[PDB]
Amino acid sequence: GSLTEDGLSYKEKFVVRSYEVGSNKTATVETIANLLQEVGCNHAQSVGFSATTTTMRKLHLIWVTARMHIEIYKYPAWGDVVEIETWCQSEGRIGTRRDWILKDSVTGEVTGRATSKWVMMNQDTRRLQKVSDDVRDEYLVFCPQEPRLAFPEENNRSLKKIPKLEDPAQYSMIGLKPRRADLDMNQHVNNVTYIGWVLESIPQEIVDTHELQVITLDYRRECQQDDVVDSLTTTTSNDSQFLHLLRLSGDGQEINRGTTLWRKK
Amino acid sequence: GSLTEDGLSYKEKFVVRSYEVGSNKTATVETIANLLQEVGCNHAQSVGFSATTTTMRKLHLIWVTARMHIEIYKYPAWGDVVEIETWCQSEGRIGTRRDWILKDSVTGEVTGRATSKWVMMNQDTRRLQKVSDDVRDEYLVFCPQEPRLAFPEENNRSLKKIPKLEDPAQYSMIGLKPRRADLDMNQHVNNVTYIGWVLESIPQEIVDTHELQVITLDYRRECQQDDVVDSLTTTTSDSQFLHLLRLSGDGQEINRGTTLWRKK
Ligand SMILES: CN(CC(=O)N1CCCCC1)S(C)(=O)=O
Ligand SMILES: CN(CC(=O)N1CCCCC1)S(C)(=O)=O
Ligand SMILES: CN(CC(=O)N1CCCCC1)S(C)(=O)=O
Ligand SMILES: CN(CC(=O)N1CCCCC1)S(C)(=O)=O
């Protein structure tokens, strides 16, 4: 993997592994999401990060994901090489965005794209805050200044507001809990585990006859390692659409909400 | 990755990923086990497998793991390159063995080793059988003929018999169940998921102060996608533990095993 010529984006190639694919012998959306995280980490390391600045470290501030949006046109097959390009962009005091483009290494065609919205949070109190001027200046040197959007479209799917699923849910998967493999190097639940939990309540008949095209996920609250989650889904719709909610098994505190769009095979 | 000069073993290099490491910023044993599976698949593909032969296909026979043994001396750090070498060997009518050696790509030092025992089974009836005459003949051309053992020591850890944990267990993790990410391309629970489930009942204080050195796991019965498992652990001692995974309801054994942990 390497930074591009101008130093404002990063590219990495991945060979899809045997355990990374589903029933169709193509990469799952969770494998894709893990590769987006990996190419994001390699980008931060390449531009000098130990992805927080010394000022953010001094203030105990971290970056946290507020929204993830992925659209896949073709999932790479087992053994295929997929090239992924990533870059960040400031969105003023609101926060920052990291975008990705996925391409088939043989054809050069775009096979997928993704975008994420990030905000600043105090790592100890968990309180949100706007991006300060001094912190913003420190990051701007690593980002393109003219807009570079993975989803440029007028009223695209990545910016649609997601409503709260009302009980009763059409489908449910209950008592889901994280194991050590679901934790990151800081003992927090990996963002990708929440995508997997959302998808646990989709009926297997949908998974067998459809392919996942779009997934948009809002992150409201972190699932702790001793938490238990319930995954809820209700059909909202040749394409099928679903509304999703992940909430704590006991009191029903919302941890995530989202939508998926599936196209018939 | 590629076959070696003689065509009897396969080597592949892997760069340890950010999500592949634990709290020590080194590869988890489940990441290691997934890389052993990956280099094993790449070996079968390189020597012409579509890892069953046309004769096995005609009989609806598959290879199934009976035992996995892994010993790690140093877990590769995030960003490190680990080289893994794998080969198979016939063990007469009993079955076959796949062995692996892990090395640090910078130093060339052996950082770990693994071995697995495999038997043939009818995929539909789930009935076991010894190597069916013409089967070992079609496989022998891909294996070294002189013994090549990852664990050569006469009667070492990889061959020790594992007893059944008696109730009550010292520690337990109950109601564990597989999600889609735990399934393979054939909708079966991935072998590596059972390693993760065995380790769920080890206390977090052990994980925080010790490193896992050895894990031996016996595979008795497959967990179906709608099954729920209980993970049981009892200290037997370095720290040593005895493990049992059984179905949450009736208590049918799915796995049993042992672990050895070294103090940091
Ligand atoms: C929101 N993602 C996290 C991410 O991109 N990263 C985490 C570490 C910083 C940059 C890379 S994801 C695909 O859900 O894992
Ligand atoms: C919000 N990002 C931080 C960021 O903008 N930067 C980090 C290094 C690349 C560009 C600058 S993230 C997704 O956490 O890496
Ligand atoms: C027993 N293992 C399976 C394995 O090595 N393989 C499966 C596919 C054929 C060869 C590779 S493991 C590391 O526990 O997944
Ligand atoms: C038991 N193995 C099959 C085998 O003997 N072989 C086929 C592939 C390489 C040559 C040898 S396994 C671990 O399932 O690949």
Swiss-Prot record, chain A:
The chain holds residues 75 to 359 of 362 of the full protein. The keyword Chloroplast applies. It comes from the Eukaryota. The active site is at N186, H188, C223. GO terms for molecular function: fatty acyl-[ACP] hydrolase activity. Keywords: Chloroplast, Fatty acid biosynthesis, Fatty acid metabolism, Hydrolase, Lipid biosynthesis, Lipid metabolism, Plastid, Transit peptide. It comes from Arabidopsis thaliana. The lineage of its organism: Eukaryota, Viridiplantae, Streptophyta, Embryophyta, Tracheophyta. GO terms for cellular component: chloroplast. Plays an essential role in chain termination during de novo fatty acid synthesis. Possesses high thioesterase activity for oleoyl-ACP versus other acyl-ACPs. Substrate preference is 18:1 > 18:0 > 16:1. It catalyses: (9Z)-octadecenoyl-[ACP] + H2O = (9Z)-octadecenoate + holo-[ACP] + H(+). The gene is FATA. This is Oleoyl-acyl carrier protein thioesterase 1, chloroplastic. Belongs to the acyl-ACP thioesterase family. Its EC number is 3.1.2.14. It is found in: Plastid, Chloroplast. One of its GO terms (biological process) is fatty acid biosynthetic process.
